[PDB]
Every structure is written in structure tokens, then in C-alpha cells.
Design a protein around this ligand. Structure first.
Ligand code: PLM
Ligand code: PLM
Length: 130
């Protein structure tokens, strides 16, 4: 299975600044990163996922298997042990460092929402070729 597989680019996001401050991203990275339309690549093979998030020269590669412990490297570089689960056939759901993350794919549009307390960091991304 490869439902999620592809290359996507950020179209818009909400509460980037407030969220990145809350989790502790260096101020200069908040400022450089706020208007970057980053590119995310996902390669799915059944339950096995590999994904890359690129923003300028910052490249973060991660991997997980649905249902198994994984170690996710976050935007600060902090690596957190968690589990990623499937919710329905179009969502990827996880919690790391008290952040609840929901990744939802609808055709060519991935909506990613990260919630830390009352802060909801929403990203909308669109497929950009193969
Ligand atoms: C030197 C270039 C500056 C790079 C700093 C920008 C990186 C900051 C992170 C912004 C992208 C947010 C990634 C969200 C991850 C996700 O929701 O899947
Ligand atoms: C920031 C640490 C990694 C995020 C943890 C979520 C793990 C499951 C989802 C992986 C696919 C993420 C693609 C998001 C698209 C985007 O907004 O850039």
C-alpha cells in the first residue's frame, strides 16, 4: 500500500510563529522559516512510512511503522519516542511532546494539524508532481 506517497508543498499555514515559539524553535529560524513554502515527501509501503520535510537548508528525515514504537525527530531536533496510528484510511495520528498531530490526505491535499494546548498549528499542502 502507498496511499500517502508523494511530493507535496505547503500552500498556507496558521499560527506558525506562536506554535514554534511555544515548542522552542530558535527565533532566527522562526523568522527565516515563517514564509518558507516547505516541501514534504512521503514514501509509504503498507505500514512502513518514510518522510522528509525540507525548509531551506533544513532537511529532516523520519521513519515509522504504524503501530510500532518510532523515534521522531522534530523541528528543534528533539527526538521523541512515540507511536503513529492510522485513523480511518486517510489519517495519520500521533502525540509527541504533548503535541497532538493529525495528518489528513484528501486526494492531492494533505492537511496537517498540530495542537499543543490551545495552540492549533494548521498546514495545508498540495501535491507537486511525482
Ligand atoms: C536556514 C533556513 C531556515 C530554515 C528554518 C525553517 C525550519 C522551521 C520549520 C518550519 C516548517 C514546519 C514543519 C512542520 C512539520 C509538519 O507539520 O509535518
Ligand atoms: C515534526 C515531527 C514529524 C511529524 C510527526 C507526524 C508523523 C506522521 C505524519 C508524517 C507525514 C507528515 C507530512 C506533513 C505534511 C506537511 O505539513 O509538511
Amino acid at each position: 500500500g502507498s496511499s500517502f506517497s508523494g511530493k507535496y508543498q505547503l500552500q498556507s499555514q496558521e499560527n506558525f510563529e506562536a506554535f514554534m515559539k511555544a515548542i522552542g524553535l530558535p527565533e532566527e529560524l522562526i523568522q527565516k522559516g515563517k514564509d518558507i513554502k516547505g516541501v514534504s515527501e512521503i514514501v509509504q509501503n503498507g505500514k512502513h512510512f518514510k518522510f522528509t520535510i525540507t525548509a531551506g537548508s533544513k532537511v529532516i528525515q523520519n521513519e515509522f511503522t504504524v503501530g510500532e514504537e518510532c523515534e521522531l525527530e522534530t523541528m528543534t531536533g528533539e527526538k521523541v519516542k512515540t507511536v503513529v496510528q492510522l485513523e480511518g484510511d486517510n489519517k495519520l495520528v500521533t502525540t509527541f511532546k504533548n503535541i497532538k498531530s493529525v495528518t489528513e490526505l484528501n486526494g492531492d491535499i494533505i492537511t496537517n494539524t498540530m495542537t499543543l494546548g490551545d495552540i492549533v498549528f494548521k498546514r495545508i499542502s498540495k501535491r507537486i508532481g511525482t
